[PDB]
Design a binder for this molecule. Structure first.
Ligand code: 4DS
Ligand code: 4DS
Ligand code: 4DS
Ligand code: 4DS
Ligand code: 4DS
Ligand code: 4DS
Ligand code: 4DS
Ligand code: 4DS
Ligand code: 4DS
Lengths: 458, 458, 458
């Protein structure tokens, strides 16, 4: 009696799971929105910095109209390798943004010290890939927030460790691994040699220096006791346990709400795989919400949910889409896009400004939101699915994405727009205020920037 | 000198062979139509009963417009596992219908007793998959009929064993394996413990109870002597020998006639794989032909061929399609569909009724056809490719499919239609007769049913 | 710590490399056009002769409108096997044309003798595949020419060995391996038993007859010392080293210029794989350029580049495409096609004739081009990607392709066209001269042929 090979099955549920972290795939949340959960862990924020900045080059004539295809190929070649390192070291990739990613090792509180050592070694092996990247590490309390409606879901992680991992990675020169102050407090100081970072309490990792009897592979194996989903036994050859997910209509209904409809169309073999990689004209509306205390999920959770319900309603009317939601050092940020896969309708610009204003007015009156700031910028951006075969997400990358992000942070409390938007809108000039030029870290040649004042003086 | 791996090649001939049983793939029939062949074997009819009945749920809003995709994923997850069991135990899947399938073990007459034991063990392992299905078995003489024209072919199996395997499976409660009377007569009674089935000569299998020296794997190996196409030797790792078919234009011309054109388009990589899975509005015309003796191929074969030639001509004019032909307990049944893949033209309904009537009038005068009955029903049905990667077929599933089937059996001798068809047609009311309501085993809430009387009183 | 399998990655750069020989993939040429390089090697020209001639049959009704699909399946089944033999024996497939291919073993001059023995054994194993094909071999000096513009590149090999390998294969009856005179001069005469070929200095291989101590596998291993890209070590399981190419935007920009845009669309998953296999009406314009000395790259290179710049400009205006460039026994030949993938515009014929004439007038005044001859023929041709998964090219095959080729050689110095072109053009009759009928080796039933005289008497 024959025994044919049990082969890998790429069911639709597995294809959906590649877009999501274990944090969501293996969650089992209540239905209320917002939903909040509390835990401890180590976070790694890795950035292939400088990439977005150079992406303008893939529009150049030398790429012969295959710039998008070449960009996603070269980006994925490098990002995939980082992803695979994270996964083999037992981490969960939470989110991709631009040319950056955020990873989590969730563990019981008593094990933070040893897991920090695992994450440090991972980081150093990540740098080792590129000898021929900047990394920030944080550790401590983390909260999860899940928000959405009956057909869409989004998640965020929040708290001091999340705020920290950002600060840490901003400080890294190239090739550094930086630890947050709390990460450095909690870590196995006997193992790692560090330097001070001038005017900072964070530190830099110089070397990992294990004791005589130390064997990293045996240490790692011990650490796996505490990793719930590390592929093992019969499945030790897989990068993710999620590769083994079986059809389950209830679970697939829950997971599909996290993925955009155009991605699902691809998943369902109803659209060619190449259709979503493109260098496409869009308008970015980057919405930032600031709170008095952004580390307290129970305070900020309802407010984010309320803002989301309104944003999604305003976006719906124009086929805008939320591409991502991230925490920033200051606030919760919604990266919204007008002009995505087959959503290309006329007056994208006037509508984008009116949408922004509507969001601004509504969110300004939401209980607990202290400040709303919105940046609007328009031009050619890369859109595509970035990451590894087993862990990837649809992402937008471009100078206009980062300009919209920087505008909302450098011009808080108002709706701002770039010159393409201002000129294109053909709204009358007195709907705007021409703004002073600010030097914006990460940006140059911004062109004139404007505030969208609105239809009336007020 | 290198020796690179001989890799599996998915040639178009192999892709076509996945839609067909070994009975056809390895046949070598004459060109006459009808063609008839005679043999002996064991038949297994397996039904995941209740599924079709629940399929209405995949149209519900909770599935967020991916009902078809979720339905085919979950159905195939379960059906695939049954298919793989059948194939490993040496059976040939003949046909899929709805959430049911028919399998055959063809063997020389002297080996029926031992092959029944193999099929019994298979059936029990099939039930074992679902601890967390109903099976009927028959054995004896079987005839094959192949009918068609110069560009299309269809096959049927016929005879008392085929009639029996239906009766047997109708009697099974859930989780039963039922044997036909002849199967029970021919089987190894020392091996199997059975109960009587009240008011039936068929029996139910309680257990397989082998003797002391018995070793099922060694018994199975012996049985493989008699299985012409059991994958073996170098190919013992394959589910089907048909996976090894090589390009052969003559054979591919013959096999392609059994597959619908839209499936071939997919096979040829000229249509996306996802296009054929859909929850689509169609009109089912289910045609039943009854004979004085439906076990005699030489009598019924020419009549079925004659009926087929006319049906196919009438269907052609409106882009109706034959989806399947099955034997029923009473008669040969053609499952015809209007509105399939890209065949969506207006007045589907009036045309469907006129087509039905034309078929009714013509088939009624075919020598040897005793009664024609036709059921017409219209609404949302699932269409898609069901089964395993290596053995699958395009199938339609839905409450309207089963309503059309039950109408043709409970209202014999006339053309009947459902309320959607009647109301939609906007043919005048006196073209119809409103019918008494019958309780139809397998159905509820049918709505009013009508006879299509036709254009004249008569 | 897990170690998941390093799996084969089908990056876009690798997909592009399948369309190209190692000669180009691993080249590192200067940017000037023309570019010329000089080396030594053995050439194998293999033809599955008679195939093109029978291809008319795949339009017959018996193929039920899947003639193109069946043709490419059966052709690739056989061609793939030849390709795999060439690759395992260490050769580089340079080009596919019709049902023929050209392969090269490049080696240092001192090793020609031993490499000829390897190529002879390969050829005999190729014949061994088909017991149930004609091969010509040449050896000696070879020049490479690369020509093109800023966005397209083409290459040719040139010289006496290239002229020889053609002569050699023209002489082969079926099943022969013929050696050129120089190949026979350079080979290991102690190993091979040959016959004279009447009225020729080339010879035919009867047998390979190695000495007592000879072990072909050990001899082959020795020969691999001299094969730069033979897959080895960790990669000994691969057919080509090019399967291991990593993303490299500079290299991909260079390689993509050799591939047509519609093929790149497929590569990029932006068009279905099946779209390019078709039996399609086109017009072939086959352009032949003759030189006083076609073995001297430094003479003919600039002239071919000049002709190319003009051809490509004339083709551009009508969406004609260069499908291939080959050396012929006499001259350089450009196989140009009007009506390719989505390039189907009206008056294909008048435009094709005017294009031809423009090319004729311009190329006639290019320094060093002695004679220009152009054949124009129109009808149904097969287009598709022919070869192996790892080494394949887009090719056109058909009686009209070979008619255009034979016209340009049998009616040198003029633009000729077939009856379909002449009649279809509805240009006035005095734009043409009706030609005497020539018996053209490889052709019958040509229909009347015409010269395109042009708009004026002159
Ligand atoms: O029955 S429903 O389709 O409405 C359904 C609603 C749910 N709502 C929520 S929350 C969660 C699940 C769910 C259906 C599950 C199945 C539907 C069809 C199957 N068919 C087969 S073969 C098997 C399953 S199973 O997952 O229960 O095995
Ligand atoms: O590529 S694999 O089969 O290994 C695979 C592993 C995953 N592992 C996990 S967790 C998740 C997905 C996955 C395959 C994805 C696709 C494979 C073929 C497609 N053709 C089309 S359209 C589209 C997709 S899609 O999901 O990326 O859209
Ligand atoms: O653009 S980044 O790759 O740095 C990025 C990745 C994220 N996630 C992932 S995966 C989340 C946020 C994020 C960008 C953050 C900022 C963007 C603009 C700012 N302007 C000012 S002043 C400040 C910040 S901050 O949050 O870093 O303080
Ligand atoms: O020659 S025909 O295309 O008309 C033909 C008619 C048949 N009618 C019937 S019944 C059955 C087969 C058939 C053609 C077979 C081939 C056609 C092309 C091949 N080319 C190559 S390389 C090889 C074969 S083979 O199968 O004979 O090897
Ligand atoms: O999936 S496998 O390559 O193992 C395979 C085994 C079979 N074994 C046997 S017997 C038959 C078919 C088969 C593959 C089928 C497809 C693979 C990719 C496709 N892409 C598209 S459009 C479409 C098909 S199709 O044939 O299902 O249409
Ligand atoms: O619908 S089923 O899954 O039971 C089915 C599968 C088949 N094949 C496969 S694979 C072939 C037939 C078939 C349905 C048969 C009937 C459908 C309606 C009837 N109404 C009455 S009275 C009686 C029968 S019967 O033939 O079972 O007597
Ligand atoms: O920077 S450009 O895009 O203009 C460029 C021009 C060339 N012109 C020529 S000749 C050759 C290469 C080339 C760009 C190379 C890269 C572009 C983006 C990368 N991103 C990441 S992660 C990595 C590379 S790499 O190959 O240099 O590693
Ligand atoms: O098929 S393999 O993945 O082994 C492969 C090996 C190669 N080896 C080398 S060197 C080059 C290419 C190659 C795969 C090609 C494709 C695979 C899937 C496609 N789907 C679509 S559209 C399209 C292509 S394509 O490149 O042929 O267009
Ligand atoms: O058509 S073929 O398969 O023989 C062919 C394959 C090639 N390449 C590849 S891969 C390159 C050329 C080629 C055809 C050459 C000719 C075509 C028509 C001729 N008419 C006359 S007189 C003479 C020649 S010749 O060059 O063989 O003398």
């Amino acid at each position: 009696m024959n025994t044919p090979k049990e082969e890998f099955q790429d069911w639709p549920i597995v294809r959906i799971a590649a877009h999501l972290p274990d944090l969501i795939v293996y969650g089992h949340f209540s239905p209320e929105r917002p939903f909040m959960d509390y835990f401890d862990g180590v976070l790694m924020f890795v950035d292939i910095s400088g990439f977005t900045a150079m992406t303008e080059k893939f529009s150049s004539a030398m790429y012969m109209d295959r710039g998008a295809e070449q960009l996603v190929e070269i980006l994925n070649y490098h990002i995939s390798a980082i992803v695979e390192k994270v996964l083999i070291f037992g981490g969960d990739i939470l989110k991709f943004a631009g040319d950056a990613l955020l990873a989590l090792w969730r563990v019981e509180r008593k094990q933070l010290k040893n897991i920090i050592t695992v994450v440090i070694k991972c980081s150093l092996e990540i740098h080792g890939l590129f000898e021929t990247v900047k990394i920030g590490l944080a550790a401590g309390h983390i909260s999860m927030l899940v928000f959405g409606d009956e057909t869409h879901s989004h998640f965020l992680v929040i708290g001091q460790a999340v705020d920290d991992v950002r600060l840490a990675q901003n400080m890294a020169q190239m090739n550094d691994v930086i630890l947050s102050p709390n990460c450095w407090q909690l870590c196995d100081r006997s193992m790692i040699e560090i330097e001070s970072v001038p005017d900072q309490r964070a530190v830099k990792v110089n070397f990992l220096k294990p004791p005589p009897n130390f064997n990293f592979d045996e240490f790692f194996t011990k650490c796996t006791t505490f990793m719930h989903y590390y592929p093992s036994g019969e499945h030790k050859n897989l990068l993710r346990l999620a590769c083994t997910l079986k059809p389950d209509p209830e679970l697939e209904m829950s997971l599909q709400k996290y993925v955009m409809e155009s991605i699902l169309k691809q998943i369902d073999n109803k659209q060619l795989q190449g259709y979503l990689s493109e260098l496409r004209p869009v308008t970015i509306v980057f919405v930032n919400l600031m709170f008095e205390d952004q580390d307290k999920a129970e305070e900020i959770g309802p407010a984010i949910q309320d803002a989301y319900m309104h944003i999604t309603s305003v976006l719906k009317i124009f086929q805008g889409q939320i591409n991502k939601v991230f925490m920033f050092d200051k606030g919760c940020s919604f990266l919204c896009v007008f002009g995505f896969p087959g959503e290309k309708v006329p007056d994208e610009l006037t509508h984008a400004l009116e949408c922004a204003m509507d969001i601004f007015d509504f969110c300004s009156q939401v209980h607990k939101i202290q400040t709303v700031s919105i940046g609007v910028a328009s031009g050619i951006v890369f859109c595509g699915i970035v990451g590894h075969t087993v862990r990837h997400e649809y992402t937008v990358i471009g100078q206009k994405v980062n300009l919209a992000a920087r505008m909302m942070m450098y011009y808080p409390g108002i709706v701002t727009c770039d010159s393409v938007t201002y000129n294109g809108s053909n709204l009358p000039a007195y709907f705007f205020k021409e703004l002073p030029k600010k030097v914006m870290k990460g940006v140059a040649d911004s062109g004139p920037l404007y505030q969208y004042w609105g239809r009336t003086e007020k």
